[PDB]
């Protein structure tokens, strides 16, 4: 329960945490490996998977951005511009993780 709640924070950052997902490149779908979990709160983490899936595609364009300074002048200055709004994504994530540690609700 609370463990899926830490684990969606790791998938908003787009880098697989607690469980193996076997996905990062057609969604990000969590696998708990049980039938006893409901699929009414694993359907919610398939909406939280598609926010993290579409995240890693902006990060990986910026990983192809690292060049000595080859092709384009505008070509890495564009991806520069996509790194600013990406920084802000990370700012809405820093208030979420702070909700998790014991100090309204922590629900999904």
């Amino acid at each position: 329960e609370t463990s899926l709640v830490r684990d969606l924070l790791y998938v908003f950052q787009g880098i697989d945490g607690k469980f193996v997902k076997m996905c990062n490149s057609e969604n990000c779908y969590k696998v708990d490996g049980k039938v006893a979990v409901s699929k009414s709160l694993k359907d919610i983490t398939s909406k939280l998977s598609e926010l993290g899936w579409l995240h890693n595609k902006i990060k990986k364009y910026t990983d192809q951005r690292s060049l000595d300074r080859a092709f384009g002048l505008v070509g890495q200055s564009f991806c520069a511009a996509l790194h600013q709004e990406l920084k802000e994504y990370y700012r809405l994530l820093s208030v979420l993780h702070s909700q998790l540690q014991v100090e309204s609700s922590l629900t999904l």
């Binding site: 802000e88 700012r91 702070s98 909700q99 309204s104």
Partner: protein, 93 residues
């Protein structure tokens, strides 16, 4: 209760203790008829409203900061009727 209510009239009007009488009766009546909250208690609704307001004025940077600061208010663990205070600030913008 009474002393605090009076001190408020005194402070905002910048006038002394027995010079606030007429307003003092108005506040006691308005407060007396609607003393307690009539709406559910739910911190989340207010934080969303405060954040839509910032969105509405495209003062998004002050909005982002406001979330950090609200989290800080919660984490300290000192207040209990956080919602009401935030709703009072929001009403006064």
């Amino acid at each position: 209760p009474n002393v605090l209510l009076q001190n408020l009239c005194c402070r905002i009007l910048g006038k002394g203790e027995a010079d606030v009488a007429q307003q003092f009766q108005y506040a006691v009546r308005v407060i007396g008829s609607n003393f307690a909250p009539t709406v559910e208690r739910d911190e989340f609704l207010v934080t969303e409203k405060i954040k839509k307001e910032f969105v509405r004025q495209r003062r998004e940077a002050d909005g982002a900061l406001f979330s950090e600061l609200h989290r800080k208010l919660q984490s300290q663990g000192v207040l209990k009727n956080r919602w009401s205070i935030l709703y009072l600030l929001l009403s006064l913008s």
